[PDB]
Structure 1
Amino acid sequence: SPLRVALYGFGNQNKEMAKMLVERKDVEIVAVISNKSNVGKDFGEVIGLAPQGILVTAGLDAAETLRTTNPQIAMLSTLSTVGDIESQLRACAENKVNVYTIAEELTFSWTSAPEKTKEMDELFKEHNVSLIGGGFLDGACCDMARTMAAMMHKIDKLDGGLQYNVDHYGQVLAIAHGVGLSEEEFYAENGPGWTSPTSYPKSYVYNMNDWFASAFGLTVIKTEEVKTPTKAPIELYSEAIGRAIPVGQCTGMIVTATTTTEEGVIIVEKQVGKCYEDGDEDMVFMNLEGNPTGGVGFTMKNPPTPAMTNTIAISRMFQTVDAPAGYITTDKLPTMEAYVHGRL
């Protein structure tokens, strides 16, 4: 009975997702794949649990590990773009393995990466399995918004976004938000504030704007990004880069994405990713302007964003397995699978 589940990647996210998936009598872990870190060790011992008789497999051996242990789904928590994860998707699809990924761009990648996306769509189609993703962006932002949007007669505008602590996802994410950079270093070709329609990767709110445009059945004209550095009126320390941020030096990044459609509906979403002052908490906000009038809005104050990314992924496992073949964006799925007691 239990669903055959592979962890593809085994860092901060897939380490916590494991803890929860062990407690779930609904699921069995048949493989754990890292690239290098922890290879050879029993996944449980890594986590602080008793050994489970499943060892961390090597990156280069993924394809054979999936061939053998025959999972129905892979929880792919490695990199953030269809390009970066192409190698791991091919391992999955070729071995008839469905995947749900927390790759942020796979929230909705058809426009940010149409070449690779078309490719992965046709691949998963070929091998009769499903590609789905987005994590926190899928569930806490888009799917919550989708439930609340059901209560609209007409939507003229969606206005929302999220704030997250850029220091708590490691160095790579911090660098990608210009955490250590001068105002001048931040703008510049090799730079995250670089203003150009050719900029890639695209921001999380770009993909999320495309998600709502698909969800609401609208026709995108254009999406534009405005990128500005964040800064602190005091010295802030960054674990991620591992030093003090002087006053006036970039502490992270704001990105607003503005989408126009043929039907006249505007979509604006703001992402704030930065090192935190004392008063700073994670936030999600979504407000709908139209009928009903005055603004139909929800806000989530201080959500445990890291753990919610994993719970969203779990809530998607059976749906991904059951979903049609190819790249399926979650606006084509039911709501995240409902909470019920008795799964443990």
Structure 2
Amino acid sequence: SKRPIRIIQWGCGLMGQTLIRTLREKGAELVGAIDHNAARRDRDAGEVAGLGQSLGVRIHPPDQADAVFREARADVCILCTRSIMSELAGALRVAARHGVNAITIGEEAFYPWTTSQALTEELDQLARANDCTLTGSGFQDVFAGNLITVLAGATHRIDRIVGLTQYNADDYGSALAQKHGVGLDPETFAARIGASNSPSYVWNSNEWLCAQLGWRVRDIRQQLLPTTHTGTLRSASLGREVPAGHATGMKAVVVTETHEGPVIETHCVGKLYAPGEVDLNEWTLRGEPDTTVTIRQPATPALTCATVLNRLPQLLAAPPGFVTTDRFTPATYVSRLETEA
């Protein structure tokens, strides 16, 4: 009474290519593929993902998404494109009007209820009307999320949660480098990135933590600070060199204050790496007792994609609507991506 989960991959860049390969390793099937990049449109999705054998799934531009969805008989659309709800809503609207569940790694979608309230409510109503679920996931789900809440379940009193997450901007596509001000001189950085003070990934992930812990947000204060290096570094996603003393990326510091009293202070670094630098993940719950957890050199791209796939059975079973993963039990390890026939 089971069959493979049928997936449309929307966004066939660095993360979408990993997902196309890995979803098949767990016994799902790729039934459609959408990407607007000129080097990927019209190519076989398997060839683009680095498989040796063609899948017979042609990459379509997103203007033709309705036709891909109409013929695919999909269970899920995985969306790996952009970071902000205004740039995701078009694709999420397509999935919802076809009654196809959708999960995106776009970072604002992890918890968009206050940063993009109107779009989230619009999508929630659309998904409810079409009996499907939309959600956000990726690295935050465990590594700025349930890793903390599982440790909180062993904690007597929480006074403060303090987090550090650092990832390599060169592992990801242009949208990430641009959100982090990679390759801007410091005056450009202050005028573009610092002044706009767009919500960083841990603005939304700290809201998700508060929601899961049963806390109410009273204020959020964010600073976006450029990172530097003493030598030139090369951005692959932007296709240019970043001179010494220009922004190689940014550190966001988000302080999330609750009505209940506890504060979440999260430092979120996305930058080009100097030789020897590695990804960092470290959290401290301060109170009774104090607990510090460290992940040694987290394989951030692999962990992002694996979390998305392990979420799919829960996404299928979830009630219709835009349902953020703070309302789910934690992702569990799935060996086979299958669903009821």
User: TM-score by structure 2 length?
Assistant: 0.92
**Matched position secondary structure for 1:312:** helix
The amino acid across from 1:154 in the alignment is R
**Deviations along 1:28-86, whole A, 9 cap, x unmatched?**
22211222442333222222321222222221111121122111111111111111011
Aligned residues: 334
Q: After TM superposition, list the pairs within 5 Å mapping 1:77-156 onto structure 2.
A: 77-156=80-159
Tell me the residue number matched to 1:45: 47
Deviation of 1:121 (Å): 1.2
Whole-Å Cα distance in 1 between the matches of residues 265 and 44 of structure 2?
A: 45
- Between the aligned partners of 2:57 and 2:189, the Cα distance in structure 1 is 44
Structure 1 CA distance for aligned equivalents of residues 337 and 70 of structure 2: 32
SS at match of 1:125: helix
Check whether the contact 2:83–2:176 (CA below 8 A) recurs between aligned residues. Answer: no
Matched letter for residue 33 of structure 1: I
Distance of 1:52 and 1:145 partners within structure 2: 39
Does residue 1:325 correspond to 2:315, yes or no?
no
Among candidates 213, 216, 225, match of residue 216 of structure 1:
213
In 1, Cα distance between equivalents of 2:172 and 2:225? 20
State the partner residue of 1:8: 10
Q: By how many angstroms is 1:145 displaced?
A: 1.6
Where does residue 20 of structure 1 map in the other structure? 22
What is the aligned partner in structure 1 of residue 255 from structure 2? 258
- Kindly state the Cα deviation for residue 327 of structure 1 after the two structures are TM-superposed: 1.2
Q: Following the alignment from structure 2 to structure 1, what is the Cα–Cα distance between the partners of residues 336 and 6?
A: 21
Q: Is the 1:281–1:301 contact (alpha carbons within 8 Å) kept by the matching residues of 2?
A: no
> Any idea what SS the aligned residue of 1:249 has?
coil
One-letter identity of the residue aligned with 2:5: L
Cα distance between partner residues in 1 of 2:157 and 2:193? 36
Q: Percent identity?
A: 32
Aligned-pair Cα RMSD in Å = 1.9
CA distance in 1, matches of 2:81, 2:233: 28
| 1:10 partner SS | coil
**What letter is aligned with 1:298?**
V
- 1:282 to 2:279 alignment: yes
Mean CA deviation greater in 309-318 or 36-45: 36-45
2:300 maps to 1:305: yes
2: distance between equivalents of 1:269 and 1:247?
27
Q: CA deviation at 1:312?
A: 0.8
CA distance in 2, matches of 1:135, 1:121: 20
Q: 1:246 to 1:56 in 2, by over 3 A?
A: closer
Post-superposition offset of 1:6: 1.3
The CA distance in 1 between the partners of 2:148 and 2:256, in whole Å, is 17
CA distance in 2, matches of 1:224, 1:116: 23
Aligned pair 1:207/2:204, yes or no? yes
